[PDB]
Design a protein around this ligand. Structure first.
Ligand SMILES: [Zn+2]
Lengths: 67, 101, 213, 136, 25
RNA sequence: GCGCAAGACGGACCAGAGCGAAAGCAUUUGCCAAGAAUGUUUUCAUUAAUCAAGAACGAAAGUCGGAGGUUCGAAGACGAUCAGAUACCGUCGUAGUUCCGACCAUAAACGAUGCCGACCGGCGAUGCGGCGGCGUUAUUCCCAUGACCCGCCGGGCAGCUUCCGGGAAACCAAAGUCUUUGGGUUCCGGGGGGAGUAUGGUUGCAAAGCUGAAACUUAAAGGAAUUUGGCGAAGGGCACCACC
C-alpha cells in the first residue's frame, strides 16, 4: 500500500431504489462536508434514512447494480 | 410456415451480399441481416466529466466522444437484450423505439 | 542496481518560424558516454502537437508531426513531417444518407519534397430539401475528384514547403475546393485529412536556419 | 530528473497511454516524442489474482502508483491517449480505462488533450474462430 | 438420425461395397 | 517510438439502393467490348412465344502440376470441463484458404412461387430517362446547365390499406379474372417406408454426377390455427409452507 487514505465523512441527499440479488443493499446519493459540492453514488448495507451521516473508507470507488 | 413478409433480412434484388462478423461472437453473418447499433459514447460518462473539467489545463475544454458501430448476430443480440420477441400484430412495425432524451 | 534516471538530460524542442508559439515542450535522453552520443538519440524522434497548442486562437482538431533534424545544444530544432486530423472529428464528419468522396495526389514542391496529400469532400443536404437521400451520380464524383486533383496539384507545385505549410495552417485548400465544386454538386465539409512525407533531400543545415528565422 | 524550470508558472508536459482490454489494463507514460518512457505499471502487478487483472480497483491502484512516480520524478501535466486492444477484435476500450483516468485526476495531475489511438483496420484479416464463432 | 449424416453413412457403405466388388474379381 | 519485408482484404460511406441470365459484383486511374430503360412523324415488314436432341456459364468444398504461403484453420499433439469428452473452451499446427493451367457439375443454387400476353382499386415514397412550372443557389442582368421545390409519363427493386376476388388456413394486388370449369406453351406428383436403393448404361484421374426399380412392410405419415403443457424464453407482480 504505502499510502494511507483518510477516512472521508459523508451525508446522504437522496435514496434510490433497492438493489442487490436478494435486496440486501440500497442505492444512495451522498455528499461530503469538506466539499459540499461533490456528490458520489455508493452501495450501503443496512437500513438507512435521509439526512444521516455515513462513513467512507475511500472516496474514489463508484456504485453498482444487482451484479 | 412463413413467419415474416421478408425473410428476416433486406435482400430483395441481390441473391448474395457481403458477410460480416459479430462483435461478441465471431459468427459470419450477412450484412443486411445483422442487427446494427451505432452508439455515440463519451470518454467520461456521468461523474468524471466534472473531475476532468475542474482539474484541467485548458479552460472551456469540450470532452471528445467515442464513435463505434456494433455488428450483432441474431442470437447474440437477443441474448444481450438488444431486441426482444413481439406479438403477431406488433411484428410488422418498423419504427425505431421511442427516445426520451 | 543504480538509479537509471539520474543520468538523464532534459532538452528542449523548438517549432519552426512559420508558427507562433516557438516553445513546444521538453524531452529527455541519457548523457554522452561511450561510443553512443546523446545527440544521436534525439535525431529520430517525431513530436505530435495539436494546432491550438501551436498557433494562438485557431482550430484544435488538426495535428502536425514534427521531427528534429539538427541540434546545437540544450534545444532540438524541428522540421515538418506531416499533418493529420483527430479520430473523433473524422468519425463525427462521416454520417449516413450522404455520399463520400476521397482524392489523393503525388505532388512535388520546387525542391526534393514529395508529398502525398489526402482530402475528403461531403455532399450537403439543402436548406429546403425534403428528400433524405442527397446522393450523387458517379460522373459527378469523377468530376469532383478531377477538380480536387487539379486544385491540389496547382497549389503545391509552384511553392516550396514553407508556403504550403503556411497555407495548411488555415484550410484555404478546403475553401478553394468547396468554391470550385459548386456547379457540380454542393459540398459543405471539405478538409485535408492527411499529408505524408516520401522523399527527403540531402541534409542542408542552412535551409534549417532560415526555417527558424 | 530535476529541471531548472519554475514550478509556479509553466508545467511539464508528457503523454500517457492507457491500453485497456477485456482482460488487462496498461498505464504507460512516455515523453512527448513517445520514444523515451518513464514508468510502466499494469493492473496485473496490483492484485495477486489474474481474474482481477481487468478490475477497476487494480487500474485505480496502478494509476495512483504511476501518478505518484511521475509527481516525484518531475511530471505534472499529461495528455491522455486511450486505446483498446484494436485490430479486428473489438473497438470498445477496457473496463478500467476511465477508472484509471479518474484516479489520475484525483492524484493531483493536470490533464490536457484527450484522444484515442485504437488501430482500426480497413477490413484487414479474418477473426480467430470458426464460421459459427465460439459457441458458449 | 438426420438425413445428411445418413446420406454420408450410405455413401461410405456404397464405397466399401464397390471396393469389395472390385476386389472380388 | 522509428524503419523494412511478405501475403491477404478493401471498414465506417453501405440503404428493404444499382447492375447481371444465374452463380455473383465495392480503393483511384487508363484501355477494349457489350447491355436495359428513356427519346424519335427513322428503317425491314410478321422476322413471333414456349421449346425433346445438342451447346455456353455455374457458390463453397474436392483432384492433378507449378510459384507463394500473413492470418484463420479439417486431421493431429496437448491443458482444463465431465462419471466418460477422442465434444462445447484455450495453446500450437498439416492439406486447404491466395494466383496461374486442367478437371466434377453439385447447394435451403429458395420468391421453397417456370416463360410470354390482356384485364381488374387507392396512396405516399424510391432509382433511371424525358416533359412542364412559382421560387432559392453556382453571389445580384440574360440563356443553357448542375443542386433544391411542385407535378406528369415509361420501365424496374419494393412498401401501406382493403368484404374486388381466391384459399384448408397462414396469407396473396397475385397465389385474382376456376362447376359461371378451355389465351399459348415446357418440365413435373399420385399414402408413408424400403429408396435416390440393387442391377444395367453413361460421365470423371479420383471423389462422385445423370438415368433409376422390385420383393417386403404399414393405417397412417403429413399442412394451417385457438385455449390449460413445459421452456436452463422474455416482460410485470406475490408468498417466512421461498430467500436475504
Ligand atoms: Zn455473435
Amino acid at each position: 500500500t504505502s499510502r494511507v487514505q483518510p477516512i472521508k465523512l459523508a451525508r446522504v441527499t437522496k435514496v434510490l431504489g433497492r438493489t442487490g440479488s436478494q435486496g440486501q443493499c440500497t442505492q444512495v446519493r451522498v455528499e461530503f462536508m469538506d466539499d459540499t459540492s461533490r456528490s458520489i453514488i455508493r452501495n450501503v448495507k443496512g437500513p438507512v434514512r435521509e439526512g444521516d451521516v455515513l462513513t467512507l473508507l475511500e472516496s474514489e470507488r463508484e456504485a453498482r447494480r444487482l451484479r | 410456415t412463413k413467419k415474416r413478409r421478408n425473410n428476416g433480412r433486406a435482400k430483395k434484388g441481390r441473391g448474395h451480399v457481403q458477410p460480416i462478423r459479430c462483435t461478441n461472437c465471431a459468427r459470419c453473418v450477412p450484412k443486411d441481416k445483422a442487427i446494427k447499433k451505432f452508439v455515440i459514447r463519451n470518454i467520461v460518462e456521468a461523474a468524471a466529466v466534472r473531475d476532468i473539467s475542474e482539474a484541467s489545463v485548458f479552460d472551456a475544454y469540450v470532452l471528445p466522444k467515442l464513435y463505434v458501430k456494433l455488428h450483432y448476430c441474431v442470437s447474440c443480440a437477443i441474448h444481450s437484450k438488444v431486441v426482444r420477441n413481439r406479438s403477431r400484430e406488433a411484428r410488422k412495425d418498423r419504427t425505431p423505439p421511442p427516445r426520451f432524451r | 542496481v543504480v538509479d537509471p534516471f539520474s543520468k538523464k538530460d532534459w532538452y528542449d524542442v523548438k517549432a519552426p518560424a512559420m508558427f507562433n508559439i516557438r516553445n513546444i515542450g521538453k524531452t529527455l535522453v541519457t548523457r554522452t558516454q561511450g561510443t553512443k552520443i546523446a545527440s544521436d538519440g534525439l535525431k529520430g524522434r517525431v513530436f505530435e502537437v495539436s494546432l491550438a497548442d501551436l498557433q494562438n486562437d485557431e482550430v484544435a482538431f488538426r495535428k502536425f508531426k514534427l521531427i528534429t533534424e539538427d541540434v546545437q545544444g540544450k534545444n532540438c530544432l524541428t522540421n515538418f513531417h506531416g499533418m493529420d486530423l483527430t479520430r473523433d472529428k473524422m468519425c463525427s464528419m462521416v454520417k449516413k444518407w450522404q455520399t463520400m468522396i476521397e482524392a489523393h495526389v503525388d505532388v512535388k514542391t520546387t525542391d526534393g519534397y514529395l508529398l502525398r496529400l489526402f482530402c475528403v469532400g461531403f455532399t450537403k443536404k439543402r436548406n429546403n430539401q425534403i428528400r433524405k437521400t442527397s446522393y450523387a451520380q458517379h460522373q459527378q464524383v469523377r468530376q469532383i475528384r478531377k477538380k480536387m486533383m487539379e486544385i491540389m496539384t496547382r497549389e503545391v507545385q509552384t511553392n516550396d514547403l514553407k508556403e504550403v505549410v503556411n497555407k495548411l495552417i488555415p484550410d484555404s485548400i478546403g475553401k478553394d475546393i468547396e468554391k470550385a465544386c459548386q456547379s457540380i454538386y454542393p459540398l459543405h465539409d471539405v478538409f485535408v485529412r492527411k499529408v505524408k512525407m516520401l522523399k527527403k533531400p540531402k541534409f542542408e543545415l542552412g535551409k534549417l536556419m532560415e526555417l527558424h528565422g | 530528473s530535476l529541471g531548472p524550470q519554475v514550478a509556479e508558472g509553466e508545467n511539464v508536459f508528457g503523454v500517457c497511454h492507457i491500453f485497456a482490454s477485456f482482460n488487462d489494463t496498461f498505464v504507460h507514460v512516455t515523453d512527448l516524442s513517445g520514444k523515451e518512457t518513464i514508468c510502466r505499471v499494469t493492473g496485473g502487478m496490483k492484485v495477486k489474482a489474474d481474474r482481477d487483472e481487468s478490475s477497476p480497483y487494480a487500474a485505480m491502484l496502478a494509476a495512483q502508483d504511476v501518478a505518484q512516480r511521475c509527481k516525484e520524478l518531475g511530471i505534472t501535466a499529461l495528455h491522455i491517449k486511450l486505446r483498446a486492444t484494436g485490430g479486428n477484435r473489438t473497438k470498445t476500450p477496457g473496463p478500467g480505462a476511465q477508472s484509471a483516468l479518474r484516479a489520475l485526476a484525483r492524484s493531483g495531475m493536470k490533464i490536457g488533450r484527450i484522444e484515442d489511438v485504437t488501430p482500426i483496420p480497413s477490413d484487414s484479416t479474418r477473426r480467430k474462430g470458426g464460421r459459427r464463432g465460439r459457441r458458449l | 438420425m438426420r438425413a445428411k449424416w445418413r446420406k454420408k453413412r450410405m455413401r461410405r457403405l456404397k464405397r466399401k461395397r464397390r471396393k469389395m466388388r472390385q476386389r472380388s474379381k
